[PDB]
Amino acid sequence: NRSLEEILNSIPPPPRLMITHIVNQNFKSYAGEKILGPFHKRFSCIIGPNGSGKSNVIDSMLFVFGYRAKLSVLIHNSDEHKDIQSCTVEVHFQKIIDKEGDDYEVIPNSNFYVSRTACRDNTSVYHISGKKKTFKDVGNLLRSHGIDLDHNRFLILQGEVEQIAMMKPKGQTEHDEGMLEYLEDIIGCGRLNEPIKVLCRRVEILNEHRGEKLNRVKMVEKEKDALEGEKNIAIEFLTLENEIFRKKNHVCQYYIYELQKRIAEMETQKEKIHEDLKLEQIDGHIAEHNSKIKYWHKEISKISNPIEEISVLSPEDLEAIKNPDSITNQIALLEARCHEMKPNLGAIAEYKKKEELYLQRVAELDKITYERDSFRQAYEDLRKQRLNEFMAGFYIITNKLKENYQMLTLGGDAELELVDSLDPFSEGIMFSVRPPKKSWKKIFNLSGGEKTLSSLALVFALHHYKPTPLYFMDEIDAALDFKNVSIVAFYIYEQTKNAQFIIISLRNNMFEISDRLIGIYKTYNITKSVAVN
After folding, report:
1. Binding-site residues from annotation for ATP
2. Interhelix angle for 358-409 vs 482-494, to 10°?
3. Cα 256 → chain centroid
4. Where in the sequence is Phosphoserine found?
5. CA quadruple 288, 289, 294, 295: dihedral positive or negative?
6. Are 88 and 126 in contact (CB under 8 A)?
């Protein structure tokens, strides 16, 4: 359970190649060893009647590339040849320079030689140029060439296009994926768009309770504020009673100075008596010593300070018996305060503990909250950036789709209608198709051929957006007018010259645009092929 910051730091970031020849030994449709024909960089076709084994080959290339659908069906399956111990199929790849003229000047270096030996013991082993490997290494070198194998887009079968004609706009379950999520994978966002959505979701819920933590560190705060206010009143009472107590020490010091000033005056008078009668001076000395005995209270032990410290006006302000208000009001104030003291440092303790240290906890949860808001808006920025890239590529491919549909249908427009313009990730994207010289209507009331024509228009749109060098089609000519067949054949011939198109059909135009015509026939259940032009 890494933090989202560690997660957001750890974010994983988001001439041509031709097939020279294919040789197949103990192949499912080929008896013994058969060499497939040469394939031009421009065009090639495998034309013939249905049931000659073309479907067997196009499923075989899925089998040999790791796409799995008793490994004896992988070997030949017929009457004359039936399930020998192993089959070996080899395909040759070479580069070729992209020239506008009709050239077959390949690069003589063999780029790839993928040989799969599939035996009857449920074991299939892959070799690249005879080196015992997997299809993963061939796939990595194809990704170096810009070709992605496990993200399959280059192969089109029929079951895909009659899936396309009745797609839900979104994949409502884990086993369904709409064109929205598949395009999100295509555009390069689905690696980081949806996982960051689910990741921020849970973290924000964890963050919520952190905001709740910030709440219940001080859920009410009024009880502690009232308690520290009362104890602050007690502390201010302590300081004020200390000041009144200092005044009381001053008043007791006024009593000691009244006694001592009286002592000094009577020393002066008894010294006058001694100057002038002896026993009268002795009586003055006795009363002076009695007052010095009574002077013990000069060490005022109340706070010992005003104990020995005198005020300014010694003959007038330094007597306590002449000011009974100073005697009475100060001790009355002291008694009222000491009755009303209840002192505690809980004002300071609660202020430094719950108004500062729990405020420090609130500040730490404020920092966690700033992390939470930074995480949620870094999410909002990343999700909106991936969404903006997704709808930007979506606008690019819909412009390419609409221009392809306009030049293929020679009129009319098929356009994808969003559920909502802001974010079509809610429940999908609908599709509305207009046939030429027809009213604008839903796709559901239209022909299946119109749906397939819009699907091939989108396929042309994604190929124009992202150049995939290989494309495979099968039996598009059925239930379709020859006009659109020749139109898309002319599109494939004219707009694409480097891109190689392989189509399985019987109508003339799809191989009249073809540079290679691989005429394949099965005579006495022995399959032989010729490569005519």
Report:
1. 48-55
2. 110
3. 83
4. 72, 311
5. positive
6. no
**Binding-site sequence positions:** 48-55
Cβ atoms 500, 513 nearer than 8 A: no
Give the Cα separation of 473 and 155 in Å (integer).
7
Number of Cβ within a 10 Å radius of residue 494: 9
Distance CA 126, CA 112 (A): 12
Structure tokens at 34: 């058969």
The H-or-E segment that residue 381 falls in is helix 358-409
Instruction: Return the closest-CA partner of residue 145 out of 495, 502, 469.
Output: 469
Residue 125 CA to residue 130 CA, distance in Å, equals 11
Which amino acid would we find at residue 425? F
C-alpha 184/C-alpha 391 separation (Å) is 9
> What is the number of other CB atoms lying within 10 angstroms of the CB of residue 370?
10
Query: Which residue's structure tokens are 């270096």?
Result: 109
**Which two structure tokens, joined as six digits, stand for 368?**
């966690």
Nearest to 32 by CA among 106, 84, 100: 84
User: Coil, helix or strand for 260?
Assistant: helix
Task: Measure Cα distances from 31 to 70, 87, 126 in Å.
Answer: 20, 11, 21
**24: closest CA among 81, 69, 109?**
81
Task: Give yes or no for a contact between 497 and 480, defined as CB atoms under 8 angstroms apart.
Answer: no
Which DSSP category does 131 fall into? Answer: E
Both tokens of 112, joined, read 């790839």
CB–CB of 402/458 below 8 Å? no
Task: Indicate if the alpha-carbon torsion angle 454, 458, 464, 468 is positive or negative.
Answer: negative
Token pair of 413 as six digits: 């427009």
- Calpha distance 486→507 (Å, rounded): 9
Buried-exposed string 183-195: b where 16+ CB fall within 10 A, e elsewhere: bbebbebbebbbe
Question: How many other CB atoms are there within 10 angstroms of residue 112's CB atom?
Answer: 18
Q: Nearest to residue 227, comparing CAs of 360, 362, 354, 358?
A: 354
DSSP secondary-structure letter at 155? B
Q: 124 pairs with which residues across the strands? A: 118
The Cα 402–Cα 332 span in angstroms is 99
The amino acid occupying position 445 is N
Q: CB-based contacts of 375: which residues, under 8 Å, 6+ apart?
A: 4, 5, 8, 200, 203, 204, 207
DSSP for residue 358: H
d(CA 489, CA 51): 23
The count of C-alpha atoms lying within 13 angstroms of the C-alpha of 272, restricted to the half-sphere facing its C-beta, is: 6
Sign of the C-alpha dihedral, residues 43, 49, 55, 60?
Answer: negative
Angle at the Cα of 246 (from 245 to 247), degrees rounded to 5? Answer: 85
Tokens standing for 139?
A: 């796939």
Question: Tokens 């111990």 label which residue?
Answer: 85
Residue 311: which region, alpha, beta or left (left: phi > 0; alpha: psi -120 to 50)? beta
